[PDB]
């Protein structure tokens, strides 16, 4: 029994909120984020309480400015230890077209502005190098995919023009057929990878879902039998399109598996998206979802739109258990 961790974050203004002179409507004071409408400036103020608050609407000469580090090595590192100790675990970024979400999943590759899952990999490859006892050894595998109109891409395998089956195995569960699965020894050999992938990506508003999956396996060798006890987590960091048809299917089904699974049959299988991501919001995985919010007054109803969902997917609770 563990809930869905969420967390909001609220970006500088872009160019078009700048250009109609927008006002910022977001407010944060804790973990309590309040959203004015400037449609309705007396009426009450809608007031929201989430696990994370990220104000990051500033720069980060501001004391109370979230970078990216400090959001990694805040939810970031939590999700990176659930995985250690043996549980599936996922972080989704969910919101309005050009709210943050690419930003904060995967941001720059240049002088700070790293997002949470490149830190997550140099996180996680730093902490299977400090190992120090020999009976533990470690495996990391890489897969990368873009779900774009319910069809599915590998991105580390650009080479291949397919899109690639999603399918239920019979007793294991939703799978991308044929979906490459590289095994990486380093950070820099997976942050190739991920380079690689983010270039063949499509291709300026972005309707398209990346997932990028890692299956970390900890091999325990006893002493005495010669038998060697795995533990796998599956780390699943997800980039989703922004929300405003094929090309919308699965952002409206997960809306909908969403709402669903906070209310407590569900339509997982009426996209793509929520079959892949089934376990991930109502089974065994430590689930986390970043809301990433635009701060102008112009974006009203939409940033209104993502808190209440947001909102919503506090609500959901999932069954979990370590996978020893
Ligand atoms: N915290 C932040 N600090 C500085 N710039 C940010 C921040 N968040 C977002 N941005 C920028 O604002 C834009 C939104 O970026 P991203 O590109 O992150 O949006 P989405 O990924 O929200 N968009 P979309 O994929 O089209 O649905 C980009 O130009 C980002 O570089
Ligand atoms: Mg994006």
């Given at each position: 029994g563990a809930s869905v961790k969420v967390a909001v974050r609220v970006?500088?203004?872009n160019s078009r909120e700048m250009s109609r002179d927008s006002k910022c409507i977001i407010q944060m004071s804790g973990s309590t984020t309040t959203i004015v409408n400037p449609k309705q400036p007396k009426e009450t103020p809608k007031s929201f309480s989430f696990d994370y608050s990220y104000w990051?609407?500033?720069?980060?000469?501001?004391?109370?400015?979230?970078?990216?580090?400090?959001?990694?090595?805040?939810?970031?590192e939590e999700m990176l230890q659930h995985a250690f100790e043996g549980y599936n675990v996922c972080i989704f970024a969910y919101g309005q077209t050009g709210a943050g979400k690419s930003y904060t999943m995967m941001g720059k590759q240049e002088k700070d502005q790293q997002?949470?899952?490149?830190?997550?990999?140099?996180?996680?490859f730093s902490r299977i190098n400090d190992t120090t006892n020999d009976n533990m050894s470690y495996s990391v595998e890489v897969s990368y995919m873009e779900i774009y109109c319910e069809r599915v891409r590998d991105l580390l395998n650009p080479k291949n023009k397919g899109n690639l089956r999603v399918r239920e195995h019979p007793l294991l569960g939703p799978y991308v057929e044929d979906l490459s699965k590289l095994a990486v020894t380093?950070?820099?050999?997976?942050?190739?990878?991920?380079?690689?992938?983010?270039?063949?990506?499509?291709?300026?508003?972005?309707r398209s879902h990346a997932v990028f999956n890692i299956i970390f396996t900890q091999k325990r060798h006893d002493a005495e039998t010669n038998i060697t006890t795995e533990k796998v987590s599956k780390i699943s960091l997800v980039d989703l399109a922004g929300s405003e048809a094929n090309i919308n299917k699965s952002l409206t089904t997960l809306g909908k598996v969403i709402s669903a699974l906070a209310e407590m049959f569900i339509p997982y299988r009426d996209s793509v998206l929520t079959w892949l991501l089934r376990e991930n919001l109502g089974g065994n995985s430590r689930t986390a979802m970043v809301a990433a919010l635009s701060p102008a007054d112009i974006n009203y109803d939409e940033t209104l739109s993502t808190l209440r969902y947001a909102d919503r997917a506090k609500q959901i609770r999932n069954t979990v258990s370590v996978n020893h």
């Open positions: 970006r500088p203004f990051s609407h500033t720069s980060p000469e501001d004391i109370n400015y979230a970078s990216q580090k400090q959001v990694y090595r805040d939810i970031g997002g949470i899952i490149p830190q997550l990999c140099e996180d996680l380093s950070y820099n050999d997976i942050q190739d990878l991920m380079d690689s992938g983010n270039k063949p990506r499509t291709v300026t508003s972005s």
